[PDB]
Design a binder for these strands. Structure first.
Ligand SMILES: [Mg+2]
Ligand SMILES: [Zn+2]
Ligand SMILES: [Zn+2]
Ligand SMILES: [Zn+2]
Lengths: 260, 115, 96, 67, 35, 98, 46, 404, 51, 479
RNA sequence: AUCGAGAGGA
């Protein structure tokens, strides 16, 4: 009648991904945590671009969309920032945004590559991920002699549900019951299916025997970060956000029940 | 041209209620919970947690239309229980599980980082 | 002077004939553009090849839905002439 | 025309990979080896680089309107 | 001297490539107008 | 003006005898994509008349092998009457028999 | 009042008055392009 | 509103609908209503008319609404049935060994609009209570209607032997008192044919109950399909090596038989059948041999199919495809015809310059001995193109003739 | 015998499994561009005044 | 024949036909004869030898071209009438000896049988695995696809133009697409396509699209429209002038605001415009006095941004302006898409990444198409393309889908795919996005080249309530 | 705006 008691093991933890296993929880909770990884972990991304000059071969919306897709380090600032919609300020302010500027002109006969290195931030802690101390810089546009790009941009807090640019993940691997003991899939020819990396079976055995009393446990994750957040930070933020959603629903339901 | 704004899927429109409670008159001790601006995430977790409750006879949820942002949760309990109590207890259980998971993930991350 | 002749692009008498890709790009022309069309009042026009029966050849067709049992045909045409092609038919009457 | 910033399928950043990929190819890497070196494991990200056509160079071949 | 199958595929597509390097794809239009 | 009119309107003939003249020659070049342009520049037309309902002229004759594409043809009222050259097909320009 | 146009050939900016025929003062080219507006252009980076 | 797709061929090309407002820019239609309109979603456009007075609104409401149009007077049978996804999924759903857990049943009941709120007793109580798909579908069926049908794969000898009333293959659909007692549902039971379940629902209950029946079938079955899944891939186009060898042997034997017939005709040892000249008799024999070979290879391919094969699932449910499609994908494509005859000698005594003169063998005259998976040879490709051109032309001309 | 008519609309059709067979989904712009003349009565005067 | 092969007196274009049964020899030098090149076959051997291939490989340096092949009498042009007398080998394999010889008297050989196809049909991969009508349908849909139609599109003021943001070259190609320049100007994107039933919104030739992919630029395109206008001084009485009209002097001024115009009467590049906005201000003097408004307005329901404005003089010296307006088009429900195999459909719904089904890796499909197309359509080329595209994406090469290639069959591709850790038939275990549960059936999924067609719903949606009527009859206007 | 033509869509 009561809550589960999940346990966690971390098997791999690098700068770009975290691999871990959750045990003693329900499939619905695991899938909801995955979905929150993808869509409900807040991130800082460019969502407001003013173009002062653009002589490049790409039109303004092209450049703005590419800028919006540039990942920015949000590890600690994002929790502090308010949603611009919730801020009481004018257009933008330091409590709900980060200002960026770009001003590049090509005055030479060799092609000028405008990269995220040319995005100058007002906040030292919110910068393009590739501009952090190998990996090259993200190309924005290429300029030839006489062409120029000058713009002002603001980065705001958001999550992947609104737009994919606020999605912090670069692939969420999710898996349970590596050997098909629950028979949630049915292989017409089991022997010709490659083994899962989490499989614990001999090479002569294609799948585990059917388990009539089994339930999905031991969910396997590999969360890969796009660079805006650390993978462990992605996981912790997802847990906190799901908890916050449940708490808000609880408060609203309490008000509704008391109202009658 | 007819595209809805992206924020419409999670922002409540002025005057819209987050959650509404109605009685299911077909059978006793049954309630329908309509939640606005929520999707399969919350609906699925809440439904599964409710199914874990032995005093819950029926628990289910659905999204009436994918282009709308409403979920309906139907709960039936035994006469000694209430669907409202079951819903509240399910949310409390989910919050407790998530808090424990967060604590244990923090501990595991620290362990992995030290060695 | 007797008139003006529209010129097919990239032909022998177009200004783009035998130009390098660099020269074409200097003229704001796409090097991959194949040509083979005209520009009439700024509009790009392409001539569609038209099928016709070959000339100066004898063809024998049978038409039993007609008074002739068999019909020889020859669309005779000298090399060039403002006179159109001259068609001569030779037929044998249908029995009865 | 220009390398997309992200992989359409998973969102992995690929916009900082095109020049490196070109460099590896002229170093006599096979395309599969170059993609492995750049860390593109999923075949969606691999498609991103494999199928890209850098049309922006051809556009840069034209003189700009303003000097 | 003689082309063998394993060489034949490459040889035939080399011949086709040379053809298209010479003629292009709108040769009939240009040739007719030039005539 | 005669050449300009014939190329501009596609009516192959004098402007006064426009009803008598065959239309559809000299169409506007299609530029939706590069393949569209290439196909338009290699287009062939049978002047039979789309109104006719005899299947014989619209059928794929054996002699089209290697000369006319067996697949590319509009699927509407002109099916089988508008054709496209095969990749290696060429059309002779003529020469003196002397 | 100025109505600056950019010459298509020499890329020179030259004033053009209404009712004045289009012609570049430098090279005599007859094709000119209008300069980008000074109005505020703002895009969402979506 | 009045909804219409051109050409307007019969009454059910213009039907009344109730308006629902949705975000994006398209008209949205229920899948079952596509058949009356002959509509699909590959770029089709449809027209909407808004009646402007209470009288015209009442006329459309009382005469032309979709539920009233379910049965057509053209053939005293329904014009709307259950279609592709729902049909295939319901065929899979009503199989004997389909078992559902408590939560899955609860979800499916979530999607049942006419449900009275009572969870039926599971068919299996111990161990682990389990519901069958037939129980849920019985909950879907309206009223207490009685209907008997046969599944498409029902063997012909079953009704005469034992097990007539206890079907080993779970064919023999029986609905009694509104309950699906037995049988696998398919096009024959949920389609537009006379005497189907939907027809009996319309005749026994009103148009409103039948409308709810259509909608509930679709919603419940689609939500279950989210669990079951359905696909088609390369694996469904393959056959075992034994099947391939049998097909190759059949083709080789047919080719040798045609060679024997040709040799007989060349030595004047062939006699014309009554009412036919020698050439017609020879063509008849050759076409008989090739048709028999095609039928035999198709039967072999049919036999090779497993119960998991998705082509076969689609065909058996009646959702899409035929056994001929399977034969052509897995086994020979077959003979190509122009104007009801083998490929003509377009060249002089020759179908293509790659053959010798007076070659009447299967390859020369357009017998495609390859399957679509194997791929056609160039000559087979050209002959197949000729065949397809025939059908395109036929469409393009019949349209105007029939319109007049 | 045939005419062009007012109060009509046309657009592409797409599937919707979540509509009843007697329903049609209509885009907002189409619905906002077409009108039905409703007669004012004491029953509906408030609703129509709001409209 | 010797003379023609040596090119002494008879040019290559000349046709010489001998009718042996008859006693006629027909020679044609006329224009308009369709012909094709063929390899000449001697006793049972090609005249094309290894040395010719070696010389052609270095054609850049040794200036050895196709003309030299024709000059050496190794290739010949054959028209239809002469083809009637030719004994043609499909491949050099036909010239080999057999236990029972078929012909043994071949005169010519095909260079490659795939040359029977035209430009549009040459981009279909594995066309010999499809029903022919589907190849015919693709032959048109390819002409309707979006790409980069020409490299200098920035300088052309075409009436209509569509440009795709991120064209890709297909992972699976035919060898003849090299000469169509499809690599340089491709029209389409390689998409991760799953053939599955998922929520029912891809039924009856509809497709489900990934909204997160669309957010990232998947199949985003830009639409250009050009407006042209000129001011005419035809007569001393009436003259048209480009200017910003004022309501005091001009009469027929619509209620649209003319403040978007400059003092020259023209809008400036970078200005947002909507339906019924004036973009060219023009007045005509009368024979609100002395001027009648004749301004040009943006077409109703266009809503673009002014791209560039060009001003010139036309042939008669009158001032002439062209205005290009650009409109970014994000793929949405109702837009038309098609693979290269005649499989076309409109987008039925779009799901975000978390709602889409996923593999054990993070991979979700970009597009989900319905399995109920293949059975009746019999477009097996589509499935084989998906399999080979998965193989090629994993391996790092471009798959070869040239039609009549014996070196490529489904079993070899399947064996290659198994080597990379995938089910050999291209199937995969997918998890339901909504619940995370495994899907009982395994799903066919892989990269497939898809095209965005010019037919978009926002250019078709239309409704009317008592608008303008015709003059002669008072019935509603057309269009 | 009218007329014609052409190209397309279902
Ligand atoms: Mg259709
Ligand atoms: Zn603020
Ligand atoms: Zn990826
Ligand atoms: Zn100048």
């Amino acid at each position: 009648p009561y809550a589960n008691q999940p346990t966690v093991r971390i098997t791999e933890l690098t700068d770009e991904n975290v691999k871990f296993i959750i045990e003693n929880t329900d499939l619905a909770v695991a899938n909801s945590i995955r979905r929150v990884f993808i869509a409900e972990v807040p991130i800082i991304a460019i969502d407001w671009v003013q173009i002062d000059a653009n002589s490049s071969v790409l039109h303004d919306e092209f450049i703005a969309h590419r800028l919006g897709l540039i990942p920015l380090t949000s590890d600690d600032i994002v929790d502090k920032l308010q949603y611009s919609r919730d801020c009481t300020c004018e257009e933008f302010c330091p409590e709900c945004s980060v200002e960026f500027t770009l001003d590049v002109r090509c005055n030479e006969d060799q092609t000028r590559h405008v990269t995220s290195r040319d995005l100058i931030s007002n906040s030292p802690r919110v910068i393009p991920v590739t501009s952090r101390n190998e990996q090259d810089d993200i190309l924005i546009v290429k300029l030839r002699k006489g062409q120029e790009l000058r713009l002002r941009a603001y980065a705001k807090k958001g999550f992947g549900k609104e737009h994919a640019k606020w999605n912090p993940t670069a692939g969420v691997a999710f898996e349970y019951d590596p050997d098909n003991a629950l028979r949630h899939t049915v292989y017409p020819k089991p022997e010709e299916w490659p083994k899962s990396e989490y499989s614990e079976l001999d090479e002569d055995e294609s799948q585990a025997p059917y388990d009539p009393n089994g339930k999905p446990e031991r969910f396997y994750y590999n969360v890969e970060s796009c660079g805006s957040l650390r993978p462990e930070t992605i996981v912790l933020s997802a847990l906190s956000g799901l908890k916050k959603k449940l708490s808000d629903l609880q408060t609203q339901l309490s008000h509704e029940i008391q109202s009658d | 041209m007819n595209a809805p704004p992206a924020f419409e899927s999670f922002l409540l429109f002025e005057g819209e209620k987050k959650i509404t409670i109605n009685k299911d008159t077909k059978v006793p001790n049954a309630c329908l919970f309509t939640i606005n601006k929520e999707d399969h995430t919350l609906g699925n977790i809440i439904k599964s947690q409710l199914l874990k409750d032995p005093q819950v006879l029926f628990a289910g949820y659905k999204v009436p239309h994918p282009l709308e942002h409403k979920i309906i949760i139907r709960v039936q309990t035994t006469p000694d229980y209430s669907p409202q109590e079951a819903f509240t207890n399910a949310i409390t259980d989910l919050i407790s599980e998530l808090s424990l998971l967060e604590e244990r993930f923090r501990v595991a991350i620290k362990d992995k980082q030290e060695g | 002077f007797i008139g003006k002749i529209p010129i097919m692009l990239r032909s022998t008498y177009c200004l783009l004939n035998g130009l390098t890709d660099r020269d074409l790009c200097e003229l704001n022309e796409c090097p991959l553009d194949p040509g083979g069309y005209f520009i009439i009042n700024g509009s790009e026009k392409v001539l569609i090849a038209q099928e016709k029966m070959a000339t100066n050849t004898v063809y024998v067709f049978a038409k039993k839905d007609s008074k002739y049992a068999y019909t020889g045909e020859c669309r005779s045409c000298l090399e060039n002439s403002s006179r159109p092609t001259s068609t001569i038919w030779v037929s044998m009457l249908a029995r009865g | 025309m220009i390398i997309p910033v992200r992989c359409f399928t998973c969102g992995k950043i690929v916009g900082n990979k095109w020049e490196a990929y070109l460099g590896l190819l002229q170093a006599e890497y096979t395309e599969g080896d170059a993609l492995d070196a750049l860390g593109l494991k999923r075949y969606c990200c691999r498609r991103m680089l494999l199928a890209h056509v850098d049309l922006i160079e051809k556009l840069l071949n034209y003189a700009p309107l303003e000097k | 001297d003689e082309i063998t199958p394993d060489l034949w595929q490459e040889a035939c597509w080399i011949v086709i490539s040379s053809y298209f390097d010479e003629k292009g794809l709108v040769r009939q239009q240009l040739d007719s107008f030039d005539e | 003006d005669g050449l300009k009119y014939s190329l501009a309107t596609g009516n192959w003939g004098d402007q006064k005898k426009a009803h008598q003249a065959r239309a559809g020659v000299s169409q506007v070049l299609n530029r939706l994509t590069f393949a569209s342009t290439l196909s338009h520049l290699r287009r062939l037309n049978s002047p039979i008349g789309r109104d006719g309902k005899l299947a014989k002229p619209r059928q794929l004759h054996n002699t089209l092998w290697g000369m006319v594409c067996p697949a590319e043809t509009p699927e509407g009222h002109a099916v089988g009457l508008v054709k496209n050259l095969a990749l290696m097909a060429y059309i002779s320009v003529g020469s003196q028999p002397s | 009042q100025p109505m600056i146009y950019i010459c298509g050939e020499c890329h020179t900016e030259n004033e053009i008055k209404s009712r004045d025929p289009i012609r570049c003062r430098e090279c005599g080219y007859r094709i000119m392009y209008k300069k980008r507006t000074k109005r505020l252009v703002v895009f969402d980076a979506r | 509103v009045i909804f219409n797709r051109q050409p307007t061929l019969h009454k059910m090309s213009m039907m009344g609908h109730r308006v629902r407002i949705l975000p994006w820019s398209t008209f949205r239609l229920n899948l079952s209503v596509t058949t009356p309109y002959n509509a699909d979603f590959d770029g089709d456009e449809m027209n909407l008319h808004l009646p402007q007075s209470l009288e015209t609104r009442a006329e459309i409401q009382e005469l032309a609404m979709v539920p009233r149009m379910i049965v057509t007077p053209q053939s005293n049978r329904p014009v709307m049935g259950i279609v592709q996804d729902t049909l295939t999924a319901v065929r899979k759903f009503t199989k004997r060994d389909v078992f559902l857990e408590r939560g899955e049943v609860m979800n499916l009941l979530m999607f049942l609009s006419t449900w009275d709120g009572k969870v039926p007793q599971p068919a299996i109580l111990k161990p682990r209570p389990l519901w069958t798909g037939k129980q849920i579908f019985s909950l879907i069926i309206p009223g207490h209607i009685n209907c008997i049908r046969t599944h498409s794969t029902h063997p012909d000898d079953e009704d005469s032997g034992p097990y007539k009333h206890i079907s080993p293959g779970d064919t023999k659909v029986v609905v009694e008192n509104g309950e699906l007692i037995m049988g696998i549902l398919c096009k024959k039971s949920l389609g537009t044919s006379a005497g189907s379940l939907v027809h009996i629902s319309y005749l026994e209950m009103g148009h409103d109950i039948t409308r709810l029946f259509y909608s509930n079938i679709q919603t419940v079955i689609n939500n279950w399909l989210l669990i079951e899944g359905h696909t088609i891939g390369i694996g469904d186009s393959i056959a075992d090596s034994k099947t391939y060898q049998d097909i190759q042997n059949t083709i080789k034997k047919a080719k040798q038989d045609v060679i024997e017939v040709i040799e007989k005709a060349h030595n004047n040892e062939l006699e014309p059948t009554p009412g036919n000249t020698l050439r017609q008799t020879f063509e008849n024999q050759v076409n008989r041999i090739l048709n028999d070979a095609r039928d035999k290879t198709g039967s072999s391919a049919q036999k090779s199919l497993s119960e998991y094969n998705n082509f076969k699932s689609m065909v058996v449910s009646g959702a899409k495809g035929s056994k001929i499609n399977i034969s052509q994908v897995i086994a020979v494509v077959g003979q190509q015809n122009v104007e009801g005859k083998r490929i003509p000698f377009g060249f002089k005594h020759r179908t293509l310059p790659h053959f010798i003169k007076d070659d009447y063998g299967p390859e020369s005259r357009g017998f495609v001995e390859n399957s679509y998976l194997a791929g056609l040879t160039p000559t087979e490709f050209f002959f197949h193109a000729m065949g397809g051109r025939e059908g395109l032309i036929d469409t393009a001309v019949k349209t105007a003739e029939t319109g007049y | 015998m045939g005419k062009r008519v007012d109060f009509s609309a046309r657009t592409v059709i797409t599937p919707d499994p979540n509509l009843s067979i007697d329903q049609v989904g209509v885009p907002r712009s189409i619905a906002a561009n077409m009108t039905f003349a409703e007669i004012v009565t004491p029953f509906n005067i408030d609703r129509l005044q709001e409209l | 024949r010797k003379l023609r092969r040596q090119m002494d007196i008879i040019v290559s274009e000349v046709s010489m036909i001998r009718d042996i049964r008859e006693r006629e020899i027909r020679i044609y030098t006329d224009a308009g004869r369709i012909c094709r090149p063929l390899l000449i076959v001697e006793k049972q051997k090609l005249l094309l030898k290894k040395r010719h291939i070696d010389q052609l490989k270095e054609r850049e340096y040794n200036n050895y071209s196709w003309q030299d092949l024709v000059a050496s009498g190794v290739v010949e042009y054959i028209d239809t009438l002469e083809e009637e007398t030719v004994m043609l080998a499909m491949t050099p394999d036909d010239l080999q000896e057999k236990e029972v010889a078929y012909c043994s008297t071949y005169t010519h050989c095909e260079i490659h049988p795939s040359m029977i196809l035209g430009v549009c049909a040459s981009i279909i991969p594995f066309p010999d695995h499809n029903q022919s009508p589907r190849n015919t349908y693709q032959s048109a849909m390819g002409k309707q696809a979006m790409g980069v139609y020409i490299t200098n599109f920035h300088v052309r003021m075409d009436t209509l133009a569509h440009v795709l943001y991120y064209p890709q070259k297909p992972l699976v190609t035919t060898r003849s697409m090299e000469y169509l320049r499809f690599r340089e100007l491709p029209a389409g994107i390689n998409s991760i396509v799953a053939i599955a039933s998922y929520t029912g919104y891809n039924q009856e030739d509809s497709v489900i699209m990934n909204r997160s992919a669309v957010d990232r630029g998947f199949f985003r395109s830009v639409f250009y429209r050009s407006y042209k206008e000129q001011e005419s001084k035809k007569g001393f009485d009436q003259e048209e002038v480009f200017e910003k009209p004022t309501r005091e002097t001009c009469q027929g001024m619509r209620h649209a605001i003319y403040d978007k115009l400059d003092d020259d009467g023209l809008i400036a590049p970078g200005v947002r415009v909507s339906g019924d906005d004036v973009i060219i201000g023009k007045t005509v003097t009368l024979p609100r006095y002395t001027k009648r408004d004749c301004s040009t307005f943006l077409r109703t329901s266009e809503t673009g941004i002014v791209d560039q404005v060009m001003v010139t003089l036309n042939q008669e010296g009158y001032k002439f302006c062209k205005i290009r307006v650009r409109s970014v088009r994000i793929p949405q429900i109702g837009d038309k898409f098609a693979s290269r195999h005649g499989q076309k459909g409109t987008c039925g719904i779009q799901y975000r990444q978390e709602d889409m089904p996923f593999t054990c890796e993070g991979i979700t499909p970009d597009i989900i198409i319905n399995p109920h197309a293949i059975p009746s359509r019999m477009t097996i080329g589509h499935l084989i393309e998906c399999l080979q595209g998965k193989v090629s994406a994993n391996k790092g090469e471009i798959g070869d889908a040239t039609p009549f290639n014996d070196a490529v069959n489904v079993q070899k591709i399947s064996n290659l795919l198994s080597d990379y850790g995938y089910h050999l038939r291209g199937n995969e275990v997918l998890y339901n996005g909504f619940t995370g549960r495994k899907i009982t059936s395994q799903i066919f999924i892989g990269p497939t080249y898809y095209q965005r067609l010019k037919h978009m719903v926002d250019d078709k949606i239309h409704s009317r309530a008592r608008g303008p009527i015709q003059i002669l009859n008072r019935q509603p206007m057309e269009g």
